[PDB]
Amino acid sequence: MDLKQQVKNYTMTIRNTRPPTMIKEQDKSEFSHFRALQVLANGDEVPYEATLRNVIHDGARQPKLPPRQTQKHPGYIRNESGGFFT
Amino acid sequence: MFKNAFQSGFLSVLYSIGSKPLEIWDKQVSNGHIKRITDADIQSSVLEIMGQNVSTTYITCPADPNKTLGIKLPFLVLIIKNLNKYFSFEVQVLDDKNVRRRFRASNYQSTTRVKPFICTMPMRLDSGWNQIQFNLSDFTRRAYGTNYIETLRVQVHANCRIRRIYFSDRLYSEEELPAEFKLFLPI
Amino acid sequence: AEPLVLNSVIGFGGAIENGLIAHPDGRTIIYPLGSTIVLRDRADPRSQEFLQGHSDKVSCLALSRSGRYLASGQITYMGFTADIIIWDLESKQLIHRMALHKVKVQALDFSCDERFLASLGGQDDNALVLWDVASGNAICGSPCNTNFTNCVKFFNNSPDKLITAGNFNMNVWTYDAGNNKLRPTDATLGTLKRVFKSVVVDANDEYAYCGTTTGDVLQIALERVLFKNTGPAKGNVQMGVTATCEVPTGDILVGGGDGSLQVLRTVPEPSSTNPKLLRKMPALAGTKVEGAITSIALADMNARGFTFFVGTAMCNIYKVTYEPATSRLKEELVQTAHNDKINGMAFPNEYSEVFATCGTGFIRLWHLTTCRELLRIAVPNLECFCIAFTTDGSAILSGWSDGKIRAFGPQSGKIIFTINDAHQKAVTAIASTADSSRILSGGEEGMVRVWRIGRTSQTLEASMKDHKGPVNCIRIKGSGDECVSASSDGSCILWDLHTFKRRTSLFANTFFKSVVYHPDESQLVTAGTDRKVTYWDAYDGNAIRIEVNALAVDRDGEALVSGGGDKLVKLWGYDEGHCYFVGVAHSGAITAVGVTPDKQRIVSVGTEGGIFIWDYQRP
Amino acid sequence: MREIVHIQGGQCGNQIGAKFWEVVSDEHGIDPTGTYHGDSDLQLERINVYFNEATGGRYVPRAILMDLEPGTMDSVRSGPYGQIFRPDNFVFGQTGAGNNWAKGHYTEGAELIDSVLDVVRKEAESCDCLQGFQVCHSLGGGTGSGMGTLLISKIREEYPDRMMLTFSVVPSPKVSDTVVEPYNATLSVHQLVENADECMVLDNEALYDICFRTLKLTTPTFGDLNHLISAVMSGITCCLRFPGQLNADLRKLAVNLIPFPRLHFFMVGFTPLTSRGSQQYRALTVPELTQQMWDAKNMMCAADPRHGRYLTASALFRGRMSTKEVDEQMLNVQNKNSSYFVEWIPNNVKSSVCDIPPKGLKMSATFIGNSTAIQEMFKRVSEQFTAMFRRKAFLHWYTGEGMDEMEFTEAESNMNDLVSEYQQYQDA
Amino acid sequence: MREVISIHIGQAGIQVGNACWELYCLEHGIQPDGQMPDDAFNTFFSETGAGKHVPRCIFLDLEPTVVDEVRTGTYRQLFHPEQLISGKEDAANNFARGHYTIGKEIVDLALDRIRKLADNCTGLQGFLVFNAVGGGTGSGLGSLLLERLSVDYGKKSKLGFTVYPSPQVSTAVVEPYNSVLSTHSLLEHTDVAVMLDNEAIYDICRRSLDIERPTYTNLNRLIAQVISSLTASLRFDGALNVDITEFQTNLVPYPRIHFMLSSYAPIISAEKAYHEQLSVAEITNAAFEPASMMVKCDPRHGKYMACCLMYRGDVVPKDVNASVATIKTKRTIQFVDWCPTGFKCGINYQPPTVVPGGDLAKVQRAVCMISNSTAIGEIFSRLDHKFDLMYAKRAFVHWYVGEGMEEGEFSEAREDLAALEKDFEEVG
Amino acid sequence: NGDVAGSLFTSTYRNVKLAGKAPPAANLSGTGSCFDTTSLSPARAGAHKALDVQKDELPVW
Ligand SMILES: CC(=O)O[C@H]1C(=O)[C@@]2(C)[C@H]([C@H](OC(=O)c3ccccc3)[C@]3(O)C[C@H](OC(=O)[C@H](O)[C@@H](NC(=O)c4ccccc4)c4ccccc4)C(C)=C1C3(C)C)[C@]1(OC(C)=O)CO[C@@H]1C[C@@H]2O
Ligand SMILES: Nc1nc2c(ncn2[C@@H]2O[C@H](COP(=O)(O)OP(=O)(O)OP(=O)(O)O)[C@@H](O)[C@H]2O)c(=O)[nH]1
Ligand SMILES: Nc1nc2c(ncn2[C@@H]2O[C@H](COP(=O)(O)OP(=O)(O)O)[C@@H](O)[C@H]2O)c(=O)[nH]1
Ligand SMILES: [Mg+2]
């Protein structure tokens, strides 16, 4: 439609052509973590952060608003004729 | 890039008015400066680039090499102020045969000389603000006797004040142009 | 009987500002938990001594000089008084229990003389009160102002004046001798409106340093309280200054709400260009730690520099060794703890050395012999429920409050699959088959489903088993093929899963939380609201009937271990039914319990944000 | 897209603007340093409506701060959220306004507009698709009224197609902190009617009651009042910023509320509003939010709805809810109080809805109503004006700036013409 | 060979599309990433060079704030971004802004998207519009578009599923204006047009599925079911296969009269599905229930000019012949003299597929009843009333004349309705 | 072009108050109140200053 949206669409087309490979969007020390764990298994002396590994995902936006409960108490409201809601 | 898009009547690649005009453009400065200032004649914003050593201060249209600006509109129009300095700009073209020509226009040059890959030509700029239109399809036919397919890259060197860069697909008149695609110089 | 040795406890009170303390010239680290205080050895990360005297939750912590007794505040319910408690040291028991501050306690501190202890009311009832230590009685009291103060500090010398800062106010109060009054003097700052958060006083009462939500570190003189210098030059702290402390050399450690920990040397300097003007505070050293910094305590090593114990909002404890000789600041991560409300426990089948904890932010993995958590698979916003290991040793299943199940692996890499819309909202219980060929998901909107799972292709079948309420727990016989679904209606249902025809079993007296098979038997044990550990018959019967939430059994039915809303852990000779080897001191609603199959260890975890380890002995 | 530029005139307008920019800066989760530290992506999708990018990942507001007597501009700079403004988005003069609408609109206004217009043009062109403007007046003082209107008239003849809002604080009917206040009110109105599209009217007196009865505040300072103006000013635009099952741009709010070009003085209200005690007992449902908003107390203007009928109204919800409930609630209200609406307008409420609620809350709403009750406000002023103008009190100051008497007589008659139109459509 | 082009104009249009294109990928196993693990999907897809299936749809809108949500939703891997059109500015509930000033500049774009999409289809059955009358985009633009379509094809068939402004529940104050204008222009262009409204479906969720909190997402799932059962024969086998041509010839006896109602059955939850048998007689009776309609019209206030039935699941042709005989026996239902027949039925053997997270339950039978009844002219009489009820005051007209329109179109849109209304009376 | 009289005061205020920028350090020696005449120094402005570098800091070749 316009220059900005055409650049947007081209980038999105590239994103769709490429396989997302279910990626995790952050890569920490994989083999360093494995090596540190093997060092812990026998040598029994490894730094704590060396033992640690961290992995992140997208999760979602929308930062956990509390539930609406979608439903009252089944003593106040009745369907049309006497009858619970489901 | 700009492939599988829609170009029918106009295609604006650069506009001084916007949140970020150099979205797609790469900018390289060595002894110069780029900024956006409010012009006096056309009382609006114009993106100005200046600096010594014209051949080094410029902006390329595709963000990086190995990426082409696929655009098939014949006419190309720029809206520039004439600062009475050395100003030049270059446009690369793909012919019907897979050969990338390139034409450039300079205001410090006086003779045109066709070459296998280049065509330098003088430009007779007016005073102050003016829009310049390139056929860009008559040029390829007149130089190499071939047909125009699609532009690949655009590049504008130093000592100029840009307001509009747009492909037109035909020579529109001052009437047919919309409000944004014209020169309205106020009092 | 209470023989149960407490081998390990992992936890930390994250957002309790200034909660972390180090014993002055001592070998103990003091920090709060859900409702208790913990004194760990400074070196041996096993010797813990816990102090439990509060009812709801510790809120503030203060420790007098000379390793003398320490005070602990408390949060309470809406209209019931708080409870400041003074805990002795060299005996480690209660001394005084003072009650005011009807909403909560905001700040506490001892004077340089250990005779005075000042308190600060909550958001409501915000007043400044002084207490005597010999008699646990209030000497003086006064309401500060409408803009509620945040932190208070006794002067290092002259234990008769104290400075307090808050929203848009700073004051210095001096305790009058002729009466029970204390007179304030307000702070005069040039057209400055700063939300002071942390306040520190130098050794000689010269300059009071005060952090700010804007990010400045205002240093003011204290003879007259007027303002002197703004804060860190060459920039500004990102999330505002939160955890500020002083190094004995005269410099200041500053930690913002992003993890920026830096050292500002605060000596009144003249501005180079303009001589009659001062500079801003420069920054000697700087570093980045993970999470907002909330508490800083000192440890004089004196070899090169100083080691500061830094507690961050992410429940991580750091050891920041800084030496001003070469201006070198290196941090180490001593201990990590979960954040809050650990939801689910999981043991890999036939493995009693590593386990996994699903929490409200992401999944962590720990092991038996040491805390030393292995990894933290993060999902940003929505929380995990009912972590599970696929049988025989395989992937980790996790159903989230989104209503979607996701699978991870050992290194957990990238998401094995995402069964989305697995329920309406907030899948709650998840189980797998003994063949790892189907997965049961009981959602919160009273439904049960099962998904067939191939090797690389998933199968979304339409079981749609309708239940009467939220599914607290789901179990399946590892011997054959069956299913049990508990409920927030307690009507535990036996599903056949050969025909999916809901073998008509129903148990209705209250609503249940945890059901377990007897290993290789037709028995059942269920736990719900009312105290009920009733043994059922798989053949529609009830063998016996004897606030509980979690149950577990051994290899064979030796010791049924149980816990619930009550803060205890009850072990039972299953066949006999006696409550031998009962454990205490789990400050909160315990949520899950595990048996560590191969070995004799009971892991307990609750909403407090901590994890406990006990041994296992049955008569 | 839909970017909006924001102007603040007068001391009050510069002060509430310090909150509006502080509330929003926290909504999208940016710092007083101007850096972003939120968590979601909705903090970034439509951030450009309120900010321009900056070097180093900073965000600065698309704001303009105009006021004579730069003493006030040191205050907002010194506040905890002054470090986000570009220190060249500050136009000022050493001379005072003096509450003389004339000099604020004739002598010392004409000296600055050429500079202000230079600044607004600069960041009018910083927007890809500029949606509209919005200001913050104070119809009492000389800066707000005098400079604001002169600025507005300039914008209108430059950006006719665009839309101009106005969160003008009206004088109080009972309270008059100044003495020449009715002179500043009437003279400004003679400008707004022809040179605006939507004009919220707000009075501090109603803001004191709302803070007194509902919020149970003991000492409402001007911050709390400003804290309320900030709340609503954010509620108007959440459609432009956040996803919504029925989004409402500002131009579609206009056409749904002003059937005639002149009846563009609105009446605003916010909900939920409770103390700290009542917050524990009240439950947050669509019913609570709509009865509270439809109450005659939440109206922050000094006007009684029951003395008029709603030509049109509009409610904006934000918070995960059910659209059916809000659809029938506005129906029932339209049925019962059939005397409080008109007949030639079949359905005279619009119920927009957004998907993202406020920061710490879970459900919220905002009430906007174009009732004929506001005609009371202008009636009152038109007396205090004609009271002293009958005696030519304080008028020599106004002749001191090249003005005349025709300017007043024309101005007063403009209101009497206006309030006459509010009666025609109020058939009692 | 048998494919359709599904357009979605306006917010409600693309919202409903976000449910239809949610249902179809599940009906055919298409993963959200374009590719499943012939002719069963070609009607709604087009296999690429390898693997992916793109949905042969078009998502058009002037409000960016909702199309950009699909652009980031889970269903972005399905759509090539060249489909999803947007716009810097919207229509703001003005028919003129949608039809005259803004809509004029993007039709040429979409017309090329269609031309790039019709050429891929070998046998173009017909277009499939999702208009949402009551807005600026759906009414102003959608009408401008269909004009540009009939000049290209003419002989082709243009369908339509237009949500109509409900009588009681309405979220716009001016929508009686644009609605009339839309119909005055779409009528002579389209050839058949399904009609429905929101409240009629709100009740159905309360009566039948018994959900007290229905949102726009619930109604959208039910519009998804209507179309699937309609278009199944285009993509599935079954006795009495139905095609749009044979669907259209025997349902619109006169060129002007093409509006019609809709219905669907069974509509029950899961628990109500186990205490039933759902005989073909039950459904055809529930389908003919005036309360099960999707439009707030009274069929018993008129007759049936023609009716149509698309069953689904396990049916045999004799029972329909039996059940339809039972229906022609009852007296509540009327038929005009000049139509002895009026039932063109149809079967498919593919059952209805339920979506996880949906409100309906799994059923092996279903019926979708469409019928052109002369009773529908009453709801046209409402809009017939409210228009002159406001046009008498010339309210809001300054927007329309201010946006490239004049009074002529109103009067000219007026006469067409009175002429259309009498046509419904000439059949008796 | 534009005037120079007005711009200067507003600029100085915007620089010194609004930003944390410096005056910077305008020497006011010899000048007291507004009443006492200053004692004019014999120095001259824009004067090139001699080289202050030490003897030995000069490296040897
Ligand atoms: C435990 C809890 O829920 O506390 C609430 C709270 O109790 C109440 C009383 C809050 C609280 O508000 C006040 O106390 C208050 C005081 C003077 C004037 C106005 C409000 C609250 O401050 C307000 C605050 O609400 C917000 O943060 C809103 O999203 C609001 N925020 C701000 O205005 C704001 C901006 C910058 C810095 C701080 C706050 C908002 C509204 C519209 C658009 C954007 C943001 C929250 C949740 C609370 C407290 C803290 C007590 C109330 O305010 C709002 C707007 O939520 C007062 O009436 C509501 C009802 C809330 O229940
Ligand atoms: N059944 C159903 N109706 C909807 C939905 N969303 C909106 N509507 C109704 O559609 C009408 C307005 O649709 P819009 O698309 O927002 O209006 P528009 O055509 O875009 O015109 P502008 O608002 O000016 O851009 C209103 O009556 C809505 O109640 C939905 O999700 N489902
Ligand atoms: N909500 C709010 N209103 C204020 C505040 N200060 C002043 N007002 C009102 O604004 C009016 C004065 O306008 P002012 O801008 O100070 O004078 P001006 O410079 O000539 O325009 C008076 O009616 C004040 O009561 C404030 O801090 N908050
Ligand atoms: Mg719309």
Give the DSSP letter string of E143-207: HHHHHHHHTT-SSS-B--EEE---SS--S-SSHHHHHHHHHHHHTTT-S-EEEE-HHHHHHHIII
List the beta bridge partners of residue A55: C377
Rama region for C121: left / alpha / beta (φ>0; ψ in -120 to 50; rest): beta
Reference E204, options E285, E266, E282; nearest CA is E266
**Annotation-wise, does E220 bind a ligand?**
yes
What are the b/e assignments for E269-294, b being 16+ CB within 10 Å? ebeeeeeeebebebbbbbbbeeebbb
3-state secondary structure of C400: strand
Name E384's Cβ contacts closer than 8 Å, sequence gap at least 6: E417, E418, E421
Task: Please tell me the total number of residues recorded for chain D in this structure.
Answer: 428
Give the residue whose CA is nearest to atom 12 of ligand 3.
Answer: D141
Helices and strands in chain A, H and E counts: 3, 1
Distance CA D83, CA D77 (A): 6
**Cβ–ligand 2 contact at E229 (below 6 Å):** no
Query: Would you call B8 and E112 a contact, using CB atoms and an 8 Å cutoff?
Result: yes
Q: Entry resolution in angstroms? A: 3.6
Atom 36 of ligand 1, residue of closest alpha carbon? D23
CB A24 within 8 A of CB C413: yes
What is the spatial distance between Cα D305 and Cα D376, in angstroms, rounded to a whole number? 10
E82 touches chain B (CB under 8 A): yes
The answer to whether the beta carbons of residues C229 and C218 sit under 8 Å apart is: yes
**Which residue among E47, E246, E282, E378 is the active-site one?**
E246
* Best of B19, B20, B44, B184 to mutate (most D CBs within 10 Å, chain D): B19
Inter-chain contact C238–D276, Cβ cutoff 8 Å? Answer: no
Chain A contact set for C381 (CB, 8 A)? 59-64
Beta bridge partners of D312: D370
Q: For residue C109, how far is the Cα from the chain centroid?
A: 23
Approach to solving: cryo-EM
Chains that touch C (3 or more CB pairs under 8 A): A, D, E, F
Instruction: Please name which ligand lies nearest the alpha carbon of E139.
Output: 2
The alpha carbon of residue E16 is apart from the nearest alpha carbon of chain D, in Å, by: 12
DSSP state of C402: T
Is E118 near ligand 2, meaning CB less than 6 Å away? no
Q: Please answer whether residues D317 and A62 qualify as being in contact, where contact means their C-beta atoms are separated by less than 8 angstroms.
A: no
- Strand order from edge to edge, sheet including C127-132: C105-110, C116-121, C127-132, C138-143
> How many CB contacts within 8 angstroms connect chain C with chain D?
34
Pocket of ligand 1 (CB under 6 A): D 22-23, 26-27, 215, 224, 227-228, 231, 234, 272-274, 276, 279, 358-361
Of B183, B129, B121, residue with least CA distance to B161 = B129
Q: From CA A32, how far away is CA A23, in angstroms rounded?
A: 20
Amino acid of residue C45: P
DSSP D176-218: -SSSSHHHHHHHHHHHHTTS-S-EEEE-HHHHHHIIIIIS--S
Find the helix or strand (DSSP H, E) in which D250 lies.
Answer: helix D250-255
Query: By the 8 A CB rule, do C570 and C527 touch?
Result: no
Q: How far apart are CA B55 and CA A59, in angstroms?
A: 49
Flag if B44 and D125 touch (Cβ within 8 Å). yes
Residue E290: asked if its preceding bond is cis (omega within 30°), the reply is no
DSSP codes, C544-561: E-----EEE--SSSSEEE
Q: How far is D192 from chain B (nearest CA, A)?
A: 27
Shortest alpha-carbon distance between residue C423 and chain E (Å): 7
- Looking at the DSSP bridge assignments, the partners of residue C398 are C406
Q: Is C18 exposed, middle or buried (0-12, 13-18, 19+ CB in 10 A)?
A: buried
CA distance C609 to C600: 23
DSSP bridge partners of C183 = C174
What is the side-by-side strand order in the sheet with D90-91?
D6-9, D63-66, D90-91
Q: Confirm or deny that E35 is annotated as ligand binding.
A: no
Query: In this structure, which amino acid lies at residue E279?
Result: S
Tokens at C495, concatenated: 């599903």
- Is E246 known to be catalytic? yes
Q: How many CA atoms lie within 13 A of B138 on its CB side?
A: 8
Interface with chain A: mutation pick from D41, D284, D353, highest number of A CBs within 10 Å: D41
* Residue D70 contacts F, CB cutoff 8 Å: yes
**Rounded Cα–Cα distance for residues E369 and E129 (Å):** 19
Taking the CA of residue D17 as centre, how many other CA atoms within 13 Å lie in the half-sphere pointing to its CB?
Answer: 35
Indicate whether residue E403 lines ligand 2 (CB < 6 A): no
Residues 6+ apart with CB under 8 A from E166: E197, E198, E199, E200, E296
Look at the block and give the residue holding tokens 């004579």: D68
| Polymer length of chain E | 428
Q: Does C456 touch chain F (CB under 8 A)?
A: no
The Cα–Cα gap between D132 and E345 comes to 55
Whether C193 and D31 lie within 8 Å, measured CB to CB: no
State the CB neighbour count (10 A cutoff) for residue D339: 8
3-state secondary structure of D317: strand
Cβ of D320 and A65 within 8 Å?
Answer: yes
Contacts of D143 (CB under 8 A, 6+ apart): D9, D10, D11, D66, D67, D68, D97, D104
CB pairs under 8 A between A and C: 71
In A, which residues are within 8 Å of C334 by CB distance? 48
Q: Are C313 and C15 in contact (CB under 8 A)?
A: yes
Taking Cα atoms as reference points, which of D197, D350, D371, D255 lies closest to residue E178? D255
Binding site, annotated residues of D: 11, 69, 138, 142-144, 204, 226
For D246, residues 6+ apart whose C-beta sits below 8 A from its C-beta are D323, D351, D352, D353, E11, E171, E216
Distance of CA D253 to the CA centre of its chain: 14
d(Cα E414, Cα E184) in Å, to the nearest integer? 8
Provide, as residue numbers in chain B, all residues whose Cβ is less than 8 Å from the Cβ of E109. Answer: 6, 8
Output the furthest CA–CA distance in chain B (Å, rounded).
49
DSSP for D70-139, written as a single string:
THHHHHHHHSTT-TTS-TTSEE--SS--TT-HHHHHTTTTTTTHHHHHHHHHHHHTT-SSB-EE----BT
- Mind telling me how many Å the CA of D285 is from chain A's nearest CA? 9
Residue of B8, B19, B24, B180 to mutate for A, most A C-beta atoms under 10 A: B24
Any ligand 2 atom below 6 A from CB of E225: no
Q: Do the bridges between strand B58-60 and strand B26-28 make them parallel or antiparallel, or are there none, so unpaired?
A: antiparallel
* CB of B144 closer than 8 Å to CB of B71: no
Side chain identity at C411, as an amino acid letter?
Q
Q: Tokens 């909550």 label which residue?
A: C122
Measured between alpha carbons, how far is D352 from D235 in angstroms, rounded to an integer? 11
Residues 6+ apart with CB under 8 A from C459: C451, C452, C453
Cβ–Cβ contacts within 10 Å for residue F42, how many?
4
Closest-CA residue to E389 (of D370, D426, D340, D343): D343
For a pocket test of ligand 1, which of D22, D288, D359, D363 has the largest count of ligand atoms closer than 8 A to its C-beta? D359
Q: Is E18 annotated as a binding residue?
A: no
Whether B177 and chain A come into contact, CB under 8 Å, resolves to no
Query: Residue C602 burial (CB < 10 Å; 0-12/13-18/19+)?
Result: buried
Please say whether the beta carbons of C286 and C264 come within 8 A: no
Q: How far is CA E320 from the centre of its chain?
A: 25
Binding residues of D for Mg(2+): 69
Amino acid present at C223: E
**Between chain D and chain F, how many beta carbons pairs sit less than 8 Å apart?**
18
Decide if B57 contacts B27 (C-beta within 8 A).
Answer: no
State CA E230 to chain mean position distance: 11
Could you tell me which of C314, C218, C211 has the C-alpha nearest to residue C258? Answer: C314
At residue C408, what is the residue type? F
| Residues of A within an 8 Å Cβ radius of E | 1-2, 5, 8-9, 12-13, 16, 68, 70-72, 77, 79-80, 83, 85-86
Residue E275 forms contact with A (CB below 8 Å): no
Q: Within chain C, how many helices (H) and strands (E) appear?
A: 0, 55
How many CB atoms are located within 10 Å of the residue A8 CB?
Answer: 17
Burial of F35 per CB tally in 10 Å (0-12, 13-18, 19+): exposed
**Beta-strand (E) ranges in C324-477?**
328-336, 344-346, 354-358, 362-367, 375-378, 384-389, 396-400, 405-408, 418-419, 427-432, 438-443, 447-453, 458-459, 465-466, 474-475
**Residue B16 corresponds to which tokens in the numbers above?**
């001084």
* Residue B21 to chain A, least CA–CA distance (Å): 9
Q: Which two tokens stand for residue C318?
A: 């750091």
* Ligand nearest to C-alpha D28: 1
| E221 residue type, one letter | R
Residue type, D285: T
What residues have CB less than 8 Å from D39, skipping those under 6 apart?
A: A63, C380, C381, D29
Count of alpha carbons within 13 angstroms of residue C491, beta-carbon side:
14
The CA distances from residue C572 to B147, C133, C554, C594, D7, in Å, are 92, 45, 11, 14, 72
Two tokens at E185? 């222009």
* Residue E422 main-chain phi, psi, to 5 deg: -60, -35
Q: What 3-state DSSP class applies to C182?
A: strand
Give the CB-side neighbour count of residue E59, counting CA atoms within 13 A.
30
Integer angstrom CA distances of residue B82 from C18, D130, D150, E36, E125 = 66, 30, 36, 60, 58
The dihedral built from the CA positions of residue D143, D146, D148 and D150, taken in this order, carries a sign that is: negative
Torsion sign over Cα E33, E36, E39, E40: negative
Dihedral, CA atoms, C378, C381, C383, C387, nearest 10 degrees? -30
Query: What is residue D227's three-state secondary structure?
Result: helix
Binding partners of B (≥3 Cβ pairs within 8 A): A, D, E
> What is the DSSP secondary structure assignment for residue C373, as one 8-state letter?
-
- Rounded distance, CA C181 to CA C160, Å? 12
Q: Is B84 left (phi over 0), alpha (psi -120 to 50) or beta?
A: left
Retrieve residue C375's tokens.
Answer: 């990894």
Q: What is residue D412's three-state secondary structure?
A: helix
Please state, in angstroms and rounded to a whole number, the distance separating the CA atoms of residues D6 and D165.
Answer: 10
Host H or E run for residue C537: strand C535-537
**Interface mutation vs chain A, best among E62, E68, E79, E82, most A CBs within 10 Å:** E82
Q: What is the length of chain A?
A: 86
Residue C533 exposed, middle or buried by CB count within 10 Å (0-12, 13-18, 19+) = buried
Kindly give the distance from the C-alpha atom of residue D11 to the centroid of ligand 3, in angstroms, as a whole number: 6
